[PDB]
């Protein structure tokens, strides 16, 4: 996250860090046996690590379940990054509390104009790299979808909206990939993809998850 703030540990009981020898993306908890993340995040070996804030030290409220299945959605395109969403299943259920908590899947979609909490463990810088140990968040803007068409022409579908601002500073970046956007207490984006981080007239794009509930529902209920 670049341009944000720290979120305060546990304040963002849903956020979930990947974890394969190390933190490479993050994710959501959306029941006790499931997490929704990014399809490219996709990799064999995960484990997912709930109760987080700083991902490099032991502070006495993970809890670290390793995934049991993923399911990467089958129309996911990974040259265009339509449908990039994936389902993770935990080998155990995660013991829901103050810390731990799942967040909500959208009944609609959200609205141009409505502010968002994106957050993760990415990269904080526009030119550079640093990796910050504890939890980032930012708050930001769903942008209308000609200003996102506007800002990458020939590349925004259906399944995509962008949030963030147009003059820069303040975006998701590298390592944030399969984190959260929560609107109106529902999960309605998952960290995809941008032109760099930050970047003017360049902002974030993100899975539009309300295109998705039935597929997340009917894939929890026979899996
Ligand atoms: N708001 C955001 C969120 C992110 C997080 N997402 C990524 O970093 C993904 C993971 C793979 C690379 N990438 C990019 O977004 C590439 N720029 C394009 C690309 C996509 C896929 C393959 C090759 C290239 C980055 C930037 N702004
Ligand atoms: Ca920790």
Not at 20 to 43: E, M, R
Not at 101 to 120: E, H, N, R, Y
Not at 174 to 194: A, N, Y
Request: hydrophobic share 30%; proline share 4%; net charge positive.
């Amino acid at each position: 996250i670049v341009g944000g703030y720290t979120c305060g540990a546990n304040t963002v009981p849903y956020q979930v860090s990947l974890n394969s020898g190390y933190h490479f993306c993050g994710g959501s908890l959306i029941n006790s046996q499931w997490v929704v993340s990014a399809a490219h995040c996709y990799k064999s070996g995960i484990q997912v690590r709930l109760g987080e804030d700083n991902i490099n030290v032991v502070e006495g409220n993970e809890q670290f379940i390793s995934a049991s299945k993923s399911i990467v959605h089958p129309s996911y395109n990974s040259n265009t990054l339509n449908n990039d969403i994936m389902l993770i299943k935990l080998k155990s259920a995660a013991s829901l509390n103050s810390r731990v908590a799942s967040i909500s899947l959208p009944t609609s979609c959200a609205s141009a104009g409505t502010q968002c909490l994106i957050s993760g463990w990415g990269n904080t810088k526009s030119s550079g790299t640093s990796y910050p140990d504890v939890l980032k968040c930012l708050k930001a803007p769903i942008l209308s979808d000609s200003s996102c068409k506007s800002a990458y022409p020939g590349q925004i579908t259906s399944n995509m909206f962008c949030a963030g601002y147009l003059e820069g500073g303040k975006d998701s970046c590298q390592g944030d990939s399969g984190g959260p956007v929560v609107c109106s207490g529902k999960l309605q984006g998952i960290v995809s993809w941008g032109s760099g981080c930050a970047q003017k007239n360049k902002p974030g794009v993100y899975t539009k998850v309300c295109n998705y509930v039935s597929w997340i529902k009917q894939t929890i209920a026979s899996n």
